[PDB]
Amino acid sequence: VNPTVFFDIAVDGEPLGRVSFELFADKVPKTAENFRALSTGEKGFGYKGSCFHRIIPGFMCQGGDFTRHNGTGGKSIYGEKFEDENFILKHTGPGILSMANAGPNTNGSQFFICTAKTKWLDGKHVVFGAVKEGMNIVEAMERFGSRNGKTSKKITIADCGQLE
Numbered sequence: 001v002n003p004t005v006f007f008d009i010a011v012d013g014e015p016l017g018r019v020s021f022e023l024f025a026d027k028v029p030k031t032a033e034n035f036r037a038l039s040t041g042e043k044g045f046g047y048k049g050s051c052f053h054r055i056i057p058g059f060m061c062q063g064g065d066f067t068r069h070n071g072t073g074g075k076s077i078y079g080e081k082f083e084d085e086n087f088i089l090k091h092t093g094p095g096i097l098s099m100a101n102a103g104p105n106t107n108g109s110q111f112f113i114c115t116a117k118t119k120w121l122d123g124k125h126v127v128f129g130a131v132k133e134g135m136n137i138v139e140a141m142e143r144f145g146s147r148n149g150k151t152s153k154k155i156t157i158a159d160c161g162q163l164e
């Protein structure tokens with residue numbers, strides 16, 4: 001069954017709300033497993049405490065760089081980076097969870113949550129999940145972003161893990 005993960009989002013250290021995702025392990029097991037493990041923190045490193053360093057209203061919220069917190073870092077549980085598992089799922093609208101990357105086969109730990117349909121990313125970024133609960137919290141997060149993605153407040157993952 002597809003695992004479910006949650007993020008407890010905070011603004012400047014204050015709780016904002018919880019966001020949960022369903023990970024499509026049935027279609028992209030390797031990619032889903034990477035995100036799941038990073039969320040539980042079972043490997044000794046992960047998303048807990050990291051921030052969303054790039055938030056662009058009307059486009060997406062990007063995070064996952066738990067090593068450099070600026071988009072230059074992050075790593076997977078399979079090594080620094082791993083292959084594009086497949087492009088079965090498309091960016092069909094708000095709530096889509098997809099892997100950020102630096103070109104073909106450079107998936108690490110960085111990911112983004114779409115806040116709109118972004119078809120031009122199809123075939124370029126691997127989609128592996130979708131917001132299940134808390135899409136309103138994701139939209140709320142946009143209020144702290146900007147055209148170039150720079151955030152006006154510190155948006156962090158105060159806590160995360162696996163549900164169900």
Ligand SMILES: [Mg+2]
Pocket residue numbers: 031083084085086099107126
């Ligand atoms: Mg992949």
